[PDB]
Write a protein that binds this DNA or RNA. Sequence first.
RNA 1: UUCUUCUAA
RNA 2: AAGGCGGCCCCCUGGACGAAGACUGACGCUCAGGUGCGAAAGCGUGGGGAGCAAACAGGAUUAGAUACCCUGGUAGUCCACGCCGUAAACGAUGUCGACUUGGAGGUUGUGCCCUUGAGGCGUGGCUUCCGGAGCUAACGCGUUAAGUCGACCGCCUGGGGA
Lengths: 70, 117, 66, 151
Amino acid sequence: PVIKVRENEPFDVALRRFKRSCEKAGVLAEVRRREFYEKPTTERKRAKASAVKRHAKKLARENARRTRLY
Amino acid sequence: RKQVSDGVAHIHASFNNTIVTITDRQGNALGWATAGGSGFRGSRKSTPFAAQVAAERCADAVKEYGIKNLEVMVKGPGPGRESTIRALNAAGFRITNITDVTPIPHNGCRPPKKRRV
Amino acid sequence: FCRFTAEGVQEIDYKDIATLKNYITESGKIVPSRITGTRAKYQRQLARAIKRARYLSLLPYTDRHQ
Amino acid sequence: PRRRVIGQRKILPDPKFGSELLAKFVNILMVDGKKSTAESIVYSALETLAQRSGKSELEAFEVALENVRPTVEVKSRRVGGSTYQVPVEVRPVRRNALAMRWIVEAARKRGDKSMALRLANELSDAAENKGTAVKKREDVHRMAEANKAFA
RNA sequence: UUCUUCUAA
RNA sequence: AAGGCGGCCCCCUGGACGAAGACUGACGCUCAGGUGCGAAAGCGUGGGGAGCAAACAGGAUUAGAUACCCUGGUAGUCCACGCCGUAAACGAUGUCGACUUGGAGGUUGUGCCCUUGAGGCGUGGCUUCCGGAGCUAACGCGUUAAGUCGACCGCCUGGGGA
Ligand SMILES: [Mg+2]
Ligand SMILES: [Mg+2]
Ligand SMILES: [Mg+2]
Ligand SMILES: [Mg+2]
Ligand SMILES: [Mg+2]
Ligand SMILES: [Mg+2]
Ligand SMILES: [Mg+2]
Ligand SMILES: [Mg+2]
Ligand SMILES: [Mg+2]
Ligand SMILES: [Mg+2]
Ligand SMILES: [Mg+2]
Ligand SMILES: [Mg+2]
Ligand SMILES: [Mg+2]
Ligand SMILES: [Mg+2]
Ligand SMILES: [Mg+2]
Ligand SMILES: [Mg+2]
Ligand SMILES: [Mg+2]
Ligand SMILES: [Mg+2]
């Protein structure tokens, strides 16, 4: 996130630009992931539960798209 | 005191404390202040307000070196990740660069075990 | 919308930096296949080519190291 | 309450001055429903208060009222292992209500004989910016910036 | 932040 | 094959699959005993030792705290060569073969259409999810069966004691 302040730019623009690239490059969640040791059991289980979360919610959103509520 | 015009602001924003260090472009440090050194303790010193007065102390200590331009390297995750450079602008410094310099290994040394809290 | 499936190359060249600079980010990380839409056969070839161009100092490992 | 924001009741103005605020002050002074005595104490203490200052009774009351109005109070939140005193901004109605309570509460604690002597001396000191009522104003403000890290 | 246990038909 | 395998490069090397043919001619399947492989922890000898970390020490916490939390920290983790032969070694589902409605994918070949674009039509391998008949105590399984059958093996017989 090496960000140079452009010429005639307000500081609140560049700070908001700096928050954007750090969320883009994934810095805060990377260090928080490496703060403690995660077992290869815990890493394989959390990644598998993340896939079922991305899949059954896709099926729940499409099933709720069909039928009405009132 | 030798006057210097441009400078580098290192910010070591951890979870427990924020360390602000004004240095030159060579790494020879000019002055520093920490959030724990700003009259705060424990839960109070791990706050984004603690860092933005830590930047005010640190900018006051390099007043005599005559700094007008300053670029900022930011290291670590913390509450003073953002609130430091707001007050560091508020000292009257024309900002130049905001670089993110957190150390990221490519799965190097093993981190400690998880806190069973 | 994979580009390599359209142009049809048998193997991505690591020496073609200007192609490979369209697949790394500003901080030098390899852009995922979700974003560029690269078919996963060429994604393995592309990652194997970026890792070779990093070794020959044709691409940086990150934007920070110096 | 949980459910609704309420509609507050309307207060009469005082008979002497027509001020809504001074009649809010006589209610805070009033104990046991005896408004007639509390009407007499306020009108006796504010009589000698304007005597010491030469201004209007309504004008000189606000001067002592100005120096006891808090600007930021704190409140307990306690989301962690201990109590967090978060400094919350106080709305201008409660600013006026906390001030009149502190003047009355300080006027109970003085050692003068008459209550109107206890309250006129406290108002004359509050316009002079001393007394227990402005000391209560300080401890609220002192606890405010001692907890300004919480927001 | 810590925060245990309760027999008889 | 299972355990397992993750920068990049070279050397040696096993298996799978596909497309067309060519060829051998039942040469097959399973398997007691047997033999081989087999995570981590551990053991032996010799190295290595950054980080992490049992043990242990100190600090806290608490009624106590031989714990969780903290600050340290030794075997160990790493390498070579041996040994151990165990795990919730799990899909808690032995291997092999045949048949039985479908849908949405992933991955990896291959044929065809003018590739008139990343498309259109097929045809193989592997894999994920949902689900019909059927099955099942139910949960569910459901062409990768726990459906319908065949071959062979391993195993079960109330809970403790074990
Ligand atoms: Mg720690
Ligand atoms: Mg007991
Ligand atoms: Mg023949
Ligand atoms: Mg066999
Ligand atoms: Mg071992
Ligand atoms: Mg031993
Ligand atoms: Mg050993
Ligand atoms: Mg040894
Ligand atoms: Mg050591
Ligand atoms: Mg420890
Ligand atoms: Mg066993
Ligand atoms: Mg396993
Ligand atoms: Mg599994
Ligand atoms: Mg078993
Ligand atoms: Mg099903
Ligand atoms: Mg049956
Ligand atoms: Mg069967
Ligand atoms: Mg059954």
